[PDB]
Specification:
Two copies of one chain form a homodimer. With about 375 residues, the first copy, chain A, is of the alpha+beta class. Chain A folds into two domains: about 280 residues, Sandwich (Jelly Rolls); about 80 residues, Up-down Bundle (Methane Monooxygenase Hydroxylase, Chain G, domain 1), CATH 1.20.58.1360. Helices cover about 35% and strands about 20% of the residues of chain A. The interface between A and B is medium-sized, with 30 and 30 residues. The complex binds daminozide (2 copies) and zinc ion (2 copies). The site of one daminozide has 12 residues of chain A, from strand 6, strand 7 and strand 12.
Chain lengths: ~375, ~375
């Protein structure tokens, strides 16, 4: 029984699973603020039922695959995945649409990475306000910087009944948001504990990965249905698979933030080592980390220069970032990492000062 | 309007509040295991609806105040609190019972710290199995040790309609479990973020504390009703007040554990500084911390000697413990702390080795 097949999907559709109501949070749009995530942390998935309060702009629930073609362009190349084959290829949007409205489910093709920020569709979609407030790339990537900026903020997903993405950790160790405009997507979510990540590493690397459903090798695997109008926020590192049970069109975006930097760095190293992608969807992770380190320094200085105290999560995030900095500039590591260090940053001094301010805020 | 009064209670009974369903977890007895709390962490309150799976032994829901007198003894001294006065006194259990079954609510007296481990009532009550598995004092306090062992594992609470305990952090920075045998207790729970603890410190110390309801000075204050048969587990540090709305008899116990040692140490220092108690309900906190540090060392050694990796939460707990150790044995601090160090412990060496093993498990 191979991961993808109509018999695999058919079994999956029946599968038991641990309820999502156990771990997820279900705030409302207006409740999902920066304070809410600072206080609660962002370590479990978050399903908002209605979009009111999220600050999203979206087309109506009657937008279509054809509307997508209209706004992106028939000729744009798009990555498609063959779901009864788990393999990647380019395809012209037009041919996708041909295939789509045909009904010829002889192949099950799935589109999940159509990034449309440089198309006229960009103007019809605004991402959640929470994401825009948190996002590193959005807030802290400088304009004077001559490194390639990652552009992963807006994706369109068109997914046909019985599509399946297998268990993975997202590129960059990014966090993700998904809004289902129409249809449904079932997410199977597994917590990224050191314990589970080890089983995950082993399973990626396993010789017969394609024959083993990873959610059976772990303690808890949570089924979370994302129906029409609903929005899912998945935290850093969460190992997840996706079954699209009926035709679905969804939107989504990937971001990094300052709430659990240790888990971000961890999710980065692991996804780097296990990824079979030919390209980095998220180039220059380390570059953005460097720039964040200095911003974090400035914040500590500011908080101390005016006799206030930083939140615990940031102190730990800072410490974790600093370790990564030392690790990337050790004499033997430095050649794999040098190219990511922005030319304005004096790493020894950053590390030294970041270390000093962190010592001053420990008990 | 002073904290305690029938007009204060009367207003409280009406008060709006943020729903508890937002932050609490509601597992079942069998789901509440050591793994469950390691994976989920124990950073939000946990309400189990039915006792099945908790491993508790308890008398029936028809046990009474008189049964308590029977098993503890009429003559035992018990701390009582005058709720329209927020003041502490001793009283003979007998006189409490007289007062209790009288119905003379001219004074509102409340019993919340009757510790019955050395009475015949001890044999009728067994605490949850989760607590017994986690508890430092239960598992790691050695018998060869000549320090006074804290005895806070079993409390009986008899609380009359309109009783009120004001907002506090529990002694020792301990975590707490409460089972309501009969009646109800409403808990008003506030997260112990650095942000909220500062407002809390300020409010404790405020000149007119008695006139200000602390749950109005904070972002989020959660009403959590604990009705008959239900069991509440409150985590380290949570600032909470209690309204007993109808007559209630409940049981409970206080424990420390290894899941969030940093917050435990923090909750300790703060509660130490703000407490107006004449005695330490939890003597020798630091002593037990020393012994836990060495056990944690042995675990790191063991995990490394057999090429396995410790869970992140423990690595951080260890690091936080080690800082406290350095802080308590600095040349100038040492005289306030020396007396708590068990004579078998070579602190410089413990700290040095604990520091080394923690370095070996960082990226
Ligand atoms: C790969 N990741 C970024 N995207 C997904 O997990 C979504 C794929 C899907 O919805 O099938
Ligand atoms: C003080 N703490 C340990 N106990 C409480 O918070 C319970 C008091 C009550 O139930 O009124
Ligand atoms: Zn993904
Ligand atoms: Zn308490």
């Amino acid at each position: 029984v191979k991961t993808g097949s109509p018999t695999f999907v058919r079994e999956l559709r029946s599968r038991t699973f641990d309820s999502s109501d156990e771990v997820i949070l279900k705030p409302t749009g207006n409740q999902l603020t920066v304070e809410f995530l600072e206080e609660n942390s962002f370590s479990v998935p978050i399903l908002v039922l209605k979009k009111d309060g999220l600050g999203m702009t979206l087309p109506s629930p009657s937008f279509t695959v054809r509307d997508v073609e209209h706004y992106v362009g028939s000729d744009k190349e798009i990555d498609v995945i063959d779901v009864t084959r788990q393999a990647d290829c380019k395809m012209k949007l037009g041919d996708f649409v041909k295939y789509y409205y045909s009904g010829k489910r002889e192949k099950v093709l799935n589109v999940i990475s159509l990034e449309f920020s440089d198309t006229r569709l960009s103007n019809l979609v605004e991402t959640p306000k929470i994401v825009r407030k948190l996002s590193w790339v959005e807030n802290l990537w400088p304009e004077e910087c001559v490194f390639e900026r990652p552009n992963v903020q807006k994706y369109c997903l068109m997914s046909v009944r019985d599509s399946y993405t297998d268990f993975h950790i997202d590129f960059g160790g990014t966090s993700v948001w998904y809004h289902v405009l129409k249809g449904e997507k079932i997410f199977y979510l597994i917590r990224p504990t050191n314990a589970n990540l080890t089983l995950f590493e082993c399973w990626s690397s396993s010789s017969n990965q394609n024959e083993m459903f990873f959610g059976d090798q772990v303690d808890k695997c949570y089924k979370c249905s994302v129906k029409q109008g609903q929005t899912l926020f998945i935290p850093t590192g969460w190992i997840h698979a996706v079954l699209t049970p009926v035709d679905c069109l969804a939107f989504g975006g990937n971001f990094l933030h300052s709430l659990n930097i240790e888990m971000q760095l961890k999710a980065y190293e692991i996804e780097k080592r296990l990824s079979t992608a030919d390209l980095f969807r998220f180039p220059n992770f380390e570059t953005i980390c460097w720039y964040v380190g200095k911003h974090i320094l400035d914040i500590f200085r500011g908080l101390r220069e005016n006799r206030r105290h930083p939140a615990s999560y940031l102190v730990h995030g800072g410490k974790a970032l600093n370790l990564a900095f030392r690790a990337w500039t050790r004499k033997e590591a430095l050649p794999d990492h040098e190219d990511e260090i922005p030319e304005t940053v004096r790493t020894v001094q950053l590390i030294k000062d970041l270390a000093r301010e962190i010592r001053l805020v420990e008990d």
